[PDB]
Amino acid sequence: DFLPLYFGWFLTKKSSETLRKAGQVFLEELGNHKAFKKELRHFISGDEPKEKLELVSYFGKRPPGVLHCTTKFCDYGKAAGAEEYAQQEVVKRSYGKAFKLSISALFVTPKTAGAQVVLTDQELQLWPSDLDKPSASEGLPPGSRASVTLGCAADVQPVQTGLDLLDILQQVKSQGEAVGELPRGKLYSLGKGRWMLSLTKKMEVKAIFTGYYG
Ligand SMILES: Nc1ncnc2c1ncn2[C@@H]1O[C@H](CO)[C@H]2O[P@](O)(=S)O[C@H]21
């Protein structure tokens, strides 16, 4: 009768830790970077001092356990489109199956810290096509929203990560030069507190497609 809270790909303990660690390294490096410090007044909007901001602290709300990539939030069936999504053959067939998710970039905004996921064609079959889509997904390839949440600002909800990624991708839908080089790739400053690290080598994380119940 009733559905999960949401469906998605859940990373193994190992892959989760690899990505989490990479995310944390990025926050530390990004926060220490001259280009980021230079734009602090576009990132925070209060009476903060001239001092340095520690981003690991800023993104204080982090996933407590394994990371995941949400496909469809269902709220046990209360969410629009949940039933329709869950009844798809491909969803039922893929339930419990192993997949690999390709991580192409890490990003930061004043609201969230996340990882961009680039879904395979097979995985795109599990991406919902709802009647109620975020406006921002329009004009971009299906599944562009696909992401993993690494942290959130205090009053932010994990759903914002996907939304932030869509806004970043609309922003880059030409592309200017990078403002820095980090060990894992090039750093871009997209304005309005938004930052993207484009990985030289995509990370591959193992995960299982399944349903989460609160
Ligand atoms: N209305 C929504 N649409 C899409 N995803 C959602 C929605 N509400 C919550 N989520 C996501 O579902 C999970 C549990 O709330 C979280 O994983 P995470 O993708 S990081 O962001 C959250």
Curated annotation (Swiss-Prot):
<keyword id="KW-0597">Phosphoprotein</keyword>
<feature type="binding site">
    <location>
        <position position="70"/>
    </location>
    <ligand>
        <name>substrate</name>
    </ligand>
</feature>
<dbReference type="GO" id="GO:0007409">
    <property type="term" value="P:axonogenesis"/>
</dbReference>
<feature type="modified residue" description="Phosphoserine">
    <location>
        <position position="174"/>
    </location>
</feature>
<dbReference type="GO" id="GO:0005737">
    <property type="term" value="C:cytoplasm"/>
</dbReference>
<feature type="active site" description="Proton donor">
    <location>
        <position position="147"/>
    </location>
</feature>
<keyword id="KW-0694">RNA-binding</keyword>
<keyword id="KW-0472">Membrane</keyword>
<dbReference type="GO" id="GO:0016020">
    <property type="term" value="C:membrane"/>
</dbReference>
<dbReference type="GO" id="GO:0042470">
    <property type="term" value="C:melanosome"/>
</dbReference>
<feature type="modified residue" description="Phosphoserine">
    <location>
        <position position="45"/>
    </location>
</feature>
<dbReference type="GO" id="GO:0009214">
    <property type="term" value="P:cyclic nucleotide catabolic process"/>
</dbReference>
<dbReference type="GO" id="GO:0008344">
    <property type="term" value="P:adult locomotory behavior"/>
</dbReference>
<comment type="function">
    <text>Catalyzes the formation of 2'-nucleotide products from 2',3'-cyclic substrates. May participate in RNA metabolism in the myelinating cell, CNP is the third most abundant protein in central nervous system myelin.</text>
</comment>
<feature type="active site" description="Proton acceptor">
    <location>
        <position position="68"/>
    </location>
</feature>
<dbReference type="GO" id="GO:0043209">
    <property type="term" value="C:myelin sheath"/>
</dbReference>
<dbReference type="GO" id="GO:0009636">
    <property type="term" value="P:response to toxic substance"/>
</dbReference>
<protein>
    <recommendedName>
        <fullName>2',3'-cyclic-nucleotide 3'-phosphodiesterase</fullName>
        <ecNumber>3.1.4.37</ecNumber>
    </recommendedName>
</protein>
<feature type="binding site">
    <location>
        <position position="149"/>
    </location>
    <ligand>
        <name>substrate</name>
    </ligand>
</feature>
<keyword id="KW-0488">Methylation</keyword>
<keyword id="KW-0378">Hydrolase</keyword>
<dbReference type="GO" id="GO:0005615">
    <property type="term" value="C:extracellular space"/>
</dbReference>
<comment type="subunit">
    <text>Exists as monomers and homodimers.</text>
</comment>
<dbReference type="GO" id="GO:0004113">
    <property type="term" value="F:2',3'-cyclic-nucleotide 3'-phosphodiesterase activity"/>
</dbReference>
<keyword id="KW-0636">Prenylation</keyword>
<feature type="modified residue" description="Phosphoserine">
    <location>
        <position position="57"/>
    </location>
</feature>
<keyword id="KW-0449">Lipoprotein</keyword>
<comment type="similarity">
    <text>Belongs to the 2H phosphoesterase superfamily. CNPase family.</text>
</comment>
<dbReference type="GO" id="GO:0003723">
    <property type="term" value="F:RNA binding"/>
</dbReference>
<dbReference type="GO" id="GO:0048709">
    <property type="term" value="P:oligodendrocyte differentiation"/>
</dbReference>
